[PDB]
């Protein structure tokens, strides 16, 4: 039963039996949100906080993809910098540890152009996101048309690829959060 209540009017409505109700797999004591249907990762309906009950699933999926991608890049970059990989250059080699890298590069003046480039791309992304959400252009959430060549043709393989992206981004979220917190706490390389 996908209907919250059956009946023409609220006061005389009847509710489906609990056995008939479709329950979320992630949290079995809540009903399936039913708005994140047809999306990637819906197999385990997980929205206990009811965020999708207020925001369109498009927005939250765009945000999830952005966070996962940013965190994946951030964790790989933090790991590389901790292991010692650095750009060939006096300003980049002067900085010793990754923790002070943000401040050192802000002082050196590279982070200002870096933020300018990221902000330009992000204004473009905001425009594109509004266009896609309003359906002016035919775009999906978190889709920038990059590397569509490598996207599998089969619908099942495409869904599997998108699910792998989402799961890896979710893992990278926790990975980077733990990495940065532990680094700030102790002050050692990524292996800790």
């Amino acid at each position: 039963a996908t209907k919250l209540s059956e009946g023409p009017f609220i006061e005389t409505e009847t509710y489906p039996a609990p056995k008939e109700m479709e329950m979320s797999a992630a949290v079995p004591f809540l009903r399936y949100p039913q708005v994140l249907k047809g999306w990637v990762g819906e197999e385990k309906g997980f929205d206990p906080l009811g965020v999708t009950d207020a925001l369109p699933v498009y927005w939250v999926r765009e945000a999830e993809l952005k966070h996962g991608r940013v965190c994946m890049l951030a964790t790989v970059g933090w790991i590389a910098t901790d292991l010692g990989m650095r750009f060939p250059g006096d300003q980049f080699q002067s900085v010793q540890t990754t923790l002070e890298a943000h401040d050192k590069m802000v002082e050196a003046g590279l982070m200002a152009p870096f933020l300018g480039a990221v902000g330009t791309f992000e204004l473009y992304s905001l425009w594109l996101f509004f266009k896609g959400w309003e359906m002016e252009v035919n775009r999906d959430a978190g889709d920038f048309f990059l590397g569509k060549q490598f996207l599998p043709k089969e619908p099942a393989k495409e869904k599997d690829m998108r699910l792998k992206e989402l799961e890896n981004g979710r893992l990278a979220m926790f990975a980077f959060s733990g990495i940065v917190t532990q680094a700030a706490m102790t002050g050692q390389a990524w292996p800790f």
């Binding site: 023409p8 905001l126 509004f130 959400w133 309003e134």
Partner: protein
């Protein structure tokens, strides 16, 4: 519609934002969505105004230097880049080799300084962040337009099986027109939680910035001292933080009153209003909601105007002679505008929103008021007449006796009631101290009594005019069928004895003059008592003291600003003193000379243009045929000129006298 006259522009501009009057605005859904989008744009404008003020303080001004020596230093508002200024020699606003600057009379410097701004970098970060907030506001407007469009599309695409699907027509604007949830979240989060958040801000930033020695945030930052710290001459910051904490807690508690997200908790406003003394009213009426909001905003603006001056909340604000007066006058004028606005929108509510019952039925508050509107108006007229007669007569008695040179013959009624209230307040404050409050208690004399009765006269007459307009808006003995006609219409003809200024909009036009008068009286009282407390106390009992010791005496620096001898930094004030005098005098034209004369003059001018050789062969006059301004258009334009001149000729005077 190609067939148009030059009155087209004025007709449109008089109702550009009268969204209810828009063509093709079919439903309340469209009305509410348009209003919501306009609100978002308005918030964006406010945030851009804040960002511009912050940017100009950061760039063109001297905040860092001012905070070092706030007492003698004067803040800079912004630079002057005006080609018309003299280039041969330095201007009065420059240091003879430096960009011209303007002093700032807004107290924003004190605001930032006591908020915790120490460096121009912080102001720059704020400028940036408020610009981002403006972007966010506009994007939220767009988001909500899209969401509401998506609900209409859904309702179009999906339909309930039963014929009652048309019931959904009413609930499309539930998000914008729901009252219980809006009240709960506004009073709990927008007010109470905002106060708690500002308490947190104070404790984290403002208290450490003010206190030279470092100390960890704790309950020691919350205190209940009272009065002004001697060093900054302002309210203790630690008390402001507790204040806001207490108010925030109280309003967070009050914000659970109504049922907002679930029907299991909370009560209903319909139900309270139904069971209370006020029977019920059109809470859905947007004009009524606007009227209530405007009344509340007016009272709060008056309260801040009085209390910012009485109890100084900002560092060194009292030391700034000019900024105090400017702030008081600014917020007094804003409060008066908001009050008369609430009255005007109540009148509009009556005109086009209230659903009057049948005549004999008397069930609602509005109907009960309409039953005895005549008694209300007659008693208000009696009070106004009494106040005017006796205030003017006592003032004239004092005037004549002083002119003959016998002050002992003046009628001087001691303000015993006000003095008793003041003494009780002082007793309470002294008990609290035993367990300073500057400007909260003032000497109070017979001159104060007379000025207070004059201000009461002004308020009573303004309310008289506004109440008469509101209660005669639907109908009147002279014009029984006034509901059919719009809120503002020219007249009803020269028949029935003549019907000039017969509309509720005409009552507002009339009450506007009074508002300006009563506000001018209030501002004159404050400014005179501020400039010369002793002279005001001794001499304010007769009107020649006001005309001579206040206006004529203190007008010297302003008029002397620029002359054959030279110019000083008040030359701009002197030019705006005269520009505003001219604007007032121009408003007199539209107020006195009415439309027929000007229409005939326009006809003659049009004849001349059509007889001119070259111009006739190009300009027919058919499109946008010139016409004289309509009766209501000219009333409004003359009122605007009058208001602009009256309001804008004062700030130059106050700045000149207090600087």
């Amino acid at each position: 519609n190609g067939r148009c006259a030059t009155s087209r522009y004025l007709q449109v501009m008089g109702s550009i934002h009268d969204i209810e009057s828009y063509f093709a605005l079919d439903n309340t859904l469209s009305l509410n969505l348009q209003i919501f989008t306009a609100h978002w744009g308005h918030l964006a404008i406010i945030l851009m105004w804040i960002s511009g003020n912050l940017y100009h303080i950061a760039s063109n001004a001297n905040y860092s230097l001012w905070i070092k020596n706030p007492i003698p230093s004067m803040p800079i508002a912004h630079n002057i880049w005006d080609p018309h200024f003299t280039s041969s020699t330095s201007t009065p606003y420059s240091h003879t080799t430096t960009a011209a600057v303007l002093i700032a009379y807004s107290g924003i410097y004190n605001q930032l300084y006591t908020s915790g701004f120490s460096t121009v970098n912080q102001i720059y970060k704020a400028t940036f962040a408020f610009s981002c907030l403006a972007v966010i506001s506009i994007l939220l407007a767009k988001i909500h337009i899209r969401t509401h469009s998506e609900v209409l599309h859904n309702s179009a695409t999906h339909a309930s099986q039963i014929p009652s699907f048309f019931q959904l027509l009413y609930f499309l604007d539930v998000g914008i027109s729901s009252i219980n949830i809006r009240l709960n979240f506004h009073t709990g989060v927008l007010v109470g939680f905002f106060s708690i958040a500002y308490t947190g801000h104070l404790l984290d930033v403002a208290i450490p910035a003010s206190r030279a020695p470092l100390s960890h945030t704790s309950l020691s930052y919350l205190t209940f001292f009272g009065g002004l710290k001697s060093d900054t001459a302002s309210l203790y910051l630690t008390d402001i933080a507790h204040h806001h904490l207490a108010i925030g807690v109280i309003f967070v508690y009050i914000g659970h009153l109504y049922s907002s997200c679930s029907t299991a908790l909370g009560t209903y406003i319909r139900d309270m209003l139904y069971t209370s003394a006020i029977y019920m009213f059109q809470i859905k009426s947007l004009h009524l909601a606007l009227s209530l909001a405007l009344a509340g905003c007016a009272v709060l603006t008056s309260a801040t105007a009085q209390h910012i001056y009485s109890l100084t909340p900002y560092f060194y604000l009292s030391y700034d002679y000019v900024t105090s007066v400017t702030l008081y006058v600014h917020h007094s004028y804003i409060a008066s505008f908001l009050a008369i606005a609430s009255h005007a929108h109540a009148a509009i509510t009556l005109v086009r929103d209230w659903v009057a019952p049948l005549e004999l039925e008397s069930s609602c508050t509005i109907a009960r008021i309409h039953t005895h509107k005549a008694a209300i108006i007659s008693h208000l007229s009696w009070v106004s007449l009494w106040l005017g007669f006796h205030t003017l007569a006592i003032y004239s008695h004092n005037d004549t006796n002083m002119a003959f040179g016998s002050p002992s013959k003046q009628i001087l009624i001691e303000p015993t009631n006000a003095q008793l209230i003041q003494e009780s307040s002082g007793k309470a404050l002294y008990s609290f101290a035993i367990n300073s409050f500057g400007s909260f208690i003032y000497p109070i004399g017979p001159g104060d009594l007379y000025v207070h009765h004059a201000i009461a006269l002004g308020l009573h007459v303004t309310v008289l005019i506004l109440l008469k307009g509101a209660l005669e808006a639907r109908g009147s003995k002279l014009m029984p069928d006034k509901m059919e006609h719009s809120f503002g219409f020219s007249c009803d003809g020269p028949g029935r004895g003549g019907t000039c200024d017969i509309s509720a909009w005409d009552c507002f036009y009339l009450a506007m003059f009074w508002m300006l008068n009563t506000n001018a009286w209030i501002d004159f009282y404050f400014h005179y008592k501020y400039l010369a407390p002793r002279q005001f106390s001794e001499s304010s009992t007769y009107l020649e003291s006001w005309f001579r010791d206040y206006l004529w005496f203190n007008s010297a620096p302003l008029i002397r600003a620029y002359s054959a001898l030279g110019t000083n930094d008040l030359s701009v004030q002197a030019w705006f003193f005269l520009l505003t005098h001219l604007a007032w005098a121009t408003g007199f034209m539209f107020l006195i000379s009415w439309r027929g004369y000007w229409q005939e003059l326009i006809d003659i001018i049009l004849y001349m243009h059509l007889k001119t050789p070259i111009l006739i062969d190009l300009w027919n006059g058919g499109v946008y045929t010139p016409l004289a301004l309509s009766i209501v258009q000219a009333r409004f334009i003359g009122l605007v000129h009058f208001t602009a001149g009256l309001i804008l000729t004062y700030p130059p005077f106050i700045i000149s006298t207090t600087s």
